[model samples]
Target: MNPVAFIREKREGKKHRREDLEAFLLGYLRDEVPDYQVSAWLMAAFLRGLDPEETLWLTETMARSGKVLDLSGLPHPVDKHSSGGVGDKVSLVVGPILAASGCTFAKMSGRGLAHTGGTIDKLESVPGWRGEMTEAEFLERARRVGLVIAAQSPDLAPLDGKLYALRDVTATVESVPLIASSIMSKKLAAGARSIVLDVKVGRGAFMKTLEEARLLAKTMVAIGQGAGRRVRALLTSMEAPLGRAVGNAIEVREAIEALKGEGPGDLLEVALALAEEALRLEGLDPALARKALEGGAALEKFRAFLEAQGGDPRAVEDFSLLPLAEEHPLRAEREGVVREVDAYKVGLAVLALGGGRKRKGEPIDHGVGVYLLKKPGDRVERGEALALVYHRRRGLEEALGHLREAYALGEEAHPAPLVLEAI
Candidate 1:
């Protein structure tokens, strides 16, 4: 197929044949097609938009463009994904819960970038934890521990990587079709039969509006099901951080508490919701998820999974073993009702504290982050503490202002429901 003609077709809002799309994408991957042509095509796709069928074709083709995991031999294969947000560490708790409830939670996680913390980054806060491993070891852990997560491998979806890099440079990353195809392609390539997605919305998340979140959610769910996988999604609130902890070691500590059924109400609500959906997809009792956490089964699986991945299990017992920065409390000047806690501002505060990265490959202080002492609807007194900032000397001043602004003291606040909708 002629590359110029393909680009022109999409530019004119016309869909190409499946074989044509596949050939053009693979040709780009093979270096047979030049970058300029692909860039033009992506821009066209970004503006004109790929239809649902085109998006599915693109997802499947991208998924197959590189090495794919075959979890067929693994028992009850399932996976979870999050659109990402500040203080969002649902995977750390839910993955083990699903595993303990008789579903294999095999996941490939990426590092945290910008304000959102990452699953792999949070896990590594534990002493001696490792995410990189050969595929054999990854699958073996799934067999033995029933839960395994590792850093996403480049081999899993090379085409998506190629296209994503190009898209990043060409300013075409935000298109719903493109975004959905990019995410679902990786999930599809990772080889999970039953996929549950946590699509976060509001101030702290990438999808800032409910409309945007729903569109992205429906697109992703469509692509997953079109490719013959079981998919469910939850549109959850991210107007504030999920829980009290918002940094690496502290977030892990919070996750440990969550697994032990001692976590904050909001955190547990989101975790259990995601876990229930995952279990239901696998034809298991959704209530088993709560039972697993309550009976200590989920925590046990976490310990075993940690040991298999070389994380120090003792840290589970003593969270002090995890690294943390110095704490400085943010005291309220005058307060009545805690009306609002802006998730975006809280994330920015962490970014100021050196907990988040500004650019790819920039090092972050894993110990630095925030622990909120007050959330919406809670009452506060004059000079009462609002949050504890975990920081180094440099970031504390800048982070303090952000933290102070994050909490809005007022007469009354009606916080939105945590779980907005289920799809």
Candidate 2:
């Protein structure tokens, strides 16, 4: 079938057979189909949407676009992917925990954009750490240390990388079909034996509501399962930053604490919840996750995984290796109880400090991020620090003024529970 004809058909909302979709994707992958044609088709699908079968077809086709990781020599390579959120740095802790619990883990993570954080960024923030790894390195690390956290190389799913770059500008990112395909295609390309998705739902997540997040989660679960993998999902809240830290270095500090069983409750719960699912999928006892996480075994595995990739896992443990952020605290002006924390604005405040990227490929200051000194319900006197911003100091006062409105102070301090609700 002609690529132009296929685009016209999809644009008209006509269903294309799975074989036809496969052929078109194959053609596009081979460069027999031009980007203009594929871009038009992608935009059309973004508008008209792809049905379940179409999504499955698209995922498989994209997976076939490049080399899949051959995990035959590794122990049941199980992995997890997350729909990003503010301060969602669980991979740093969860991966090592699952590994220490006797599960092989290979995670391909992306960088942060807008207000959300990325696993690769946080890991790279550590001194002497690298996120890029060869397939051999990835597999070897997983085999020896039971885990490896790295970025997706171009040779693996090259088309998806190009398509993702296109979607970044086309306003096609918000489409449910596009989002599912983008996520599943990457995971399938990574070639895990089984997968679990952490779908973040709340004001800070991509899916704004639980119902919408659920739909996406179920769709991804079906796609992964249908494509011949053991797949599951968890719906979790992203109402605020996951823990006390929101920058690359700061989040790494929190992840270390979590591995040592001494972090914020919300971050621990989210990490454990995801770990339990990933562990259970690999036929491991989820109950062992907590023990493995706290027994220092996870920290050991984490050090080995990092050492395999030429990273010093003890960067955080050794404060000399940690990057220090110039402290910029957003303090309370008047004495009152904290009523609400506008997480979105807090994200922006950190972004202003160079904690997050405004666009893909932009430079990031790994040293920069924000930390909340006060939790939700603390009563405070005037001029007390509510949170500290880690980043460049220029124009910080102006940014603080904006974020000051984002936080709420009331007569009666009514703080919401850290983990609002879990799926």
Candidate 3:
């Protein structure tokens, strides 16, 4: 296929055939296709959606463009993915729990960008914890620890990485078809027999509307099923942060509390829900997931998984491994009940403190992030602290102002449901 002709086709709002799309993906990754052309095609794709077959073929072809994991030797194969949200450290706790329970989770994680926390970032927040590993090391770690989460090397879906950065800068990330393809392509490449997805919908998440979330979820499920892998998704709520903590170390701490079965209701609910769906997809008993949690078996398994990966699961026991920022509360502007907090803005505040990245290879302060001392719809005095801002020394005051603007106070506290609605 000719690069110029293919680029013109997409530029003219025409979709390419599977073979052409495959060639374009391969060429784009190989650098034979220039970024300008690829960027134009991506923008065109954002305007003209890919049909089911095109979507599946696009994802599958891209998935096979690089080396894939071989999970044939594992006793049980499973993996979980979240759409990403404030304080979503499910992997730090959940992966270990499953691995501890004898489930092999070969997860390839990405870095934290904007407000959504990355699993690799949270895990790397622990001293001596590494997210980079050889494929052989990953497999060995999984076999010994039952789980391993690492970043995708440049060779895996190279086009996706390039396109992802371009989309971020160009405001093209909201397209559901593009979003689904981007996520599923990397996941499919990672190689799992079955997968479960936590597709979050709310202010703190990408899919702000339920319809948007469900559509992306179904598209991903179809992609996985068509590829001969069992796939399913739960459109969970993300109106507020997943758990009480939102920073990297704080989230790891919260996840540890969850493993020990001692966390806020939302953390436990989502973890068990994702585990149950994953277990069922692999033909395991759902009850076993819950039993493992209540029996402290999950906690034990989590510890073993951490040890196998060269991390101290005891970091969970001692939250000190993750230090908190100097605590200062955002005082209420008016003396009344707190009605709402903009979860996204709070997340941005975390990013401003270097909890996330604005550019690749930028420094990330894992210890610094936002913590909601008062959850939404809670009562607050005029000058009481609602959230703690974890920030660097230079931006401490600026971050405080940002945190204050993220919240609103009303005459009467209106209690929104803890979870708006479950899907």
Candidate 4:
């Protein structure tokens, strides 16, 4: 195929045949196609937009461009994904609950860039935890331990990775077709027969509006269904942070509290909702998932998973074993009902405090982040502490400034529902 002709074809709003799409992506993967040409095509795709059928073809072709995990050998293999968020550590809770309820989870997660925190980064907050694993070890853990969450392997979907990098530089990363394909391609390559997605919407999420979130959800679900995988998506709210803790170690500690059935109500609500959907997809009793968490069965599974991954189970048992940063309190100036806790501002505060990365591939300070003492609709007294800042004193002033703007007060406040809808 002629590369310039192909670019012009897409640029002119004409759809290409599936084979053409496959051959183009394959040529790029094989290095027969140069980056500039591919980048031009990506921009064309971004502007013209691919239809649903074309999107499905692109997703499937990208998924097949690398080694796909064959989890067919494992019983009832399932996976879950979240469109990254702030104070959103549901995976750390959901995986154990599903495993304890007799489902298999082979989760592959990514690191945080900007305000969102990553699962692997949260797990690493526990002493000696590791996210890298050989394929053999990954499957062994799934078979024996029934739960495994690891960092994304480069071998999973090479084409999608390359395309994503090109998209990033070409300002084409926000196209619905590209975003949908990017997510589903990796999930499809993970080889799970069933998948559940947590698509967050609000200040801290990529999809800022409910309409945008729903479109992205339906697009991904349609792609997964076409590929013969059972898929469900939950549209959850991020208008306020998911829970009080928005950093690495602090979020892990909150997750432990959640597993013990003592966690904040909103966090557990979202986690249980996602786990229930995954359980139901596998023909398992969804109620059993809730029982696992409330009965401490899920916590036991978490301990085993940690032990299998070379993490310190003792640290998990005692949250203090994780690293710590100096805490500075942000106090309220007067008494009122909390009207808003801006998730975006809270996330930026965490990023400033070194809880998240400002650039890709930057190191995270697991001990640093922000913790909210008051959420929206809560009552506050004069001079009461509203939140805590964890830091190495590097950007504490800026973080505090952000936190001051993050919260709003009024005579009365009504908050949006945590779980908005299911698709």
Candidate 5:
């Protein structure tokens, strides 16, 4: 196929044949097709759209571009992927909950590139933790303990890696087809039978509005189903950071407590909801998810899984090993019922404090983060501390501004539901 003609067809809003689409994308991966041609095609696909068939085909091509895992021999291996969020350590809790309840959950996660925390990055907070695993290690861990989380390997979905870099450079990254394909391709290669997506909405998430979040979730679900897998998407709120902690090590600490069924009510609520969904898909007892947490079974699984990944399992019980900065509380100037914690601003505060990266591959301070002492519906008194800022040295004043401005106090507060929709 002529690269120019292929780009023109997409530009003209024509549908793609699986062979031609696969050839063009794989050609680009192999360097047979030039970046200029692919860039033109990507822009065309972005402005126009990839229909349902095209979206699934593109995902399939990317998945097959490298090694594909075959974990069918295992029982009900489930995978959950988040659309990114602040203070979202649900994976750390959900994986253990499911594993303890007799289902397998394995995932391939990446590092934090923005305000949203990454599962791999959170795991990296634990001293001696390793997210990189060989194929044998990944499969063996899943078979042994029923839970595994590893960093995304280049050998798996390398095409997506190449295309994602291209998408990053060109302005085609925001397209639904591109985003859906990018995610589903990796999910498919991971070889999980039941896939659950936590599609976050509101200030801190990429899909800010309900409509946009729904569309992306729907597209991802469609792609998963078309590619012969079970999938669901939960459009969860991200108006506030999910739990109290909003940075790498802090989030991990919060997750450890949540696994013991003793953390912020909201975090348990959402994580359990996700665990139940994944359990429901696998024909397992959904109620067992709660029991797993309450009985301490989930925490045990988390400890073992952590150690298996070369992370210090004792970090689950001991916190001094993980990086933590000095804690200073921001006092409330006025008293009112806590109405909101602006997630976007909180995330920016972390980034300012060096908890997140300004550019790709930048080093970050794992200790620096914010811990909320007040949340929605909590009564506040004048001079009371609202949030604790965890910082090393720089950006203290700037981070304080970001933290203080994030809170919206009022006489009354009515928070929205956490799980808005499921599809």
Candidate 6:
């Protein structure tokens, strides 16, 4: 394929044939095509969006660019992908419940960027827990324990990674077709036979509105099903943090509490909903998924999963085993009723406190984060504690200022619903 012709075709908003896409992407993967040429193609594709067929072709080609796992030996191997949001740790809670209820979860996750928390980052908060593992190790753990969540293997989808890096610098990162392909490609290559997605919409989410979130969800689901995988998505709200905890180690502790049936109401509701969707893919009932959590079965599965991956299981029972930072509380001033906890502001507060990354490859302080002492719809007296900032003594005042601006008080409080719809 001529590099110039490829660029011209996409730039003119003309769709390329499957063979042409295969040759072009594979050439890039093989180093026959240079980065500049691919960047041009990406920008053109971004400006002139691909149709569903073209998007699926791009996704499949990227998935085939590297090694694709074969999970035929595992029973009902399913995976979950979240669009990311503040205080979102559903994977830590829901994966165990699904596995305990007789489904296998073998997932590959990425690190946190900007304001959203990543699954791998949250898991790393536990001492001795490792996210990088060989494919053999991943498969071994999945077979023995029924679950394994590891960092993304470079062999899974190399082209997607390369394209994403180019897109990041070229101002082409937000295109719907590109975004949908990037997500579904890695998922398809991760070897899962079925997948569930948590599409978040609101202040703290990538998709800020329900319409955008639904469109992205539908696009991803279509790509998955077209590739012969069962896929479903839940459109959830991220107007506020998912739960009371919004940092690394703190969120890990929150997930532990959830597995043990002592979690916050909103967090558990979302987790159970996502888990139920995952369970349905395997022909199981939501009641069994609920029982796995409420009956202590999921907690045991979580402990076993941790121990299998060199993580200390004792941390599940003793939260002190996790990392800690200097805790300072923020109190309400002349409070009425808690009407809103702006999630975007809270996420910025976490970044200020050193819990998140400001740029790619930036080091994060795992101990620092925010814990909401009061959520929306909760009544509070004057001068009561509203939230706690866990910091490492850097930018304390700045983080506090962000937290102060995150909460709003009013005469009546009505928090948004957790799950808007399941697609």
Q: Candidates 5 and 6: which is better by lDDT?
A: 5
Q: List the residue pairs that clash in candidate 5.
A: none
The lDDT of each candidate is: 0.88, 0.77, 0.74, 0.88, 0.88, 0.86
RMSD of 5: 1.9
The runs of at least 3 residues in candidate 3 whose Cα sits more than 4 Å from the true structure, single-residue gaps closed, are 8-15, 166-172, 202-208, 333-336, 390-392, 411-423
Worst 10-residue stretch by lDDT in candidate 5? 201-210
- 1-98 in candidate 6: lDDT tens per residue? 69899999999999999999989998998899999999999999988889989999999999988999888889989888888455378889988998
Residues 41-141, model 2: lDDT tens digits: 88999888899899888888777688887776777688878774564777888888888887788877878787767788888877777878777777777
Where is model 2 more than 4 Å wrong at Cα?
202-208, 411-423
TM-score quality measure for candidate 6: 0.95
Instruction: Report the candidate with higher TM-score, 1 versus 3.
Output: 1
Q: Write the per-residue lDDT of candidate 1 for residues 180-263, one digit (tens) a residue.
A: 999999998999999998887643335456677889899999998789999999988755788899989899998899888899
In candidate 3, what are the lDDT values of residues 323-419, reduced to their tens digit? 7666655666666666666667777778877777887667688878777767656788766778776666646676676677777777676554443
In TM-score terms, which candidate is top? 1
Off by over 4 Å in 1: 202-208
TM-score (C-alpha, index-matched) for candidate 5: 0.96
For 312-414, candidate 4 gives per-residue lDDT tens digits of 9997677678867998999998899998888778888989888889888889899998889999889999989999888998889999988989898999988
Model 2 RMSD, rounded to 1 decimal: 2.6
lDDT of 5 by residue, 20-113 (tens): 9999998999999999999999999998888999999999999999999999999898988888466368888999999999988888888776
Error of 6 at 412 (Å): 1.8
lDDT for model 4, please: 0.88
lDDT of 5 at 341: 93
TM-score of each: 0.96, 0.91, 0.88, 0.96, 0.96, 0.95
Which is superior by lDDT, 1 or 3? 1
> What's the lDDT of the predicted structure labeled candidate 6?
0.86
lDDT of 2: 0.77
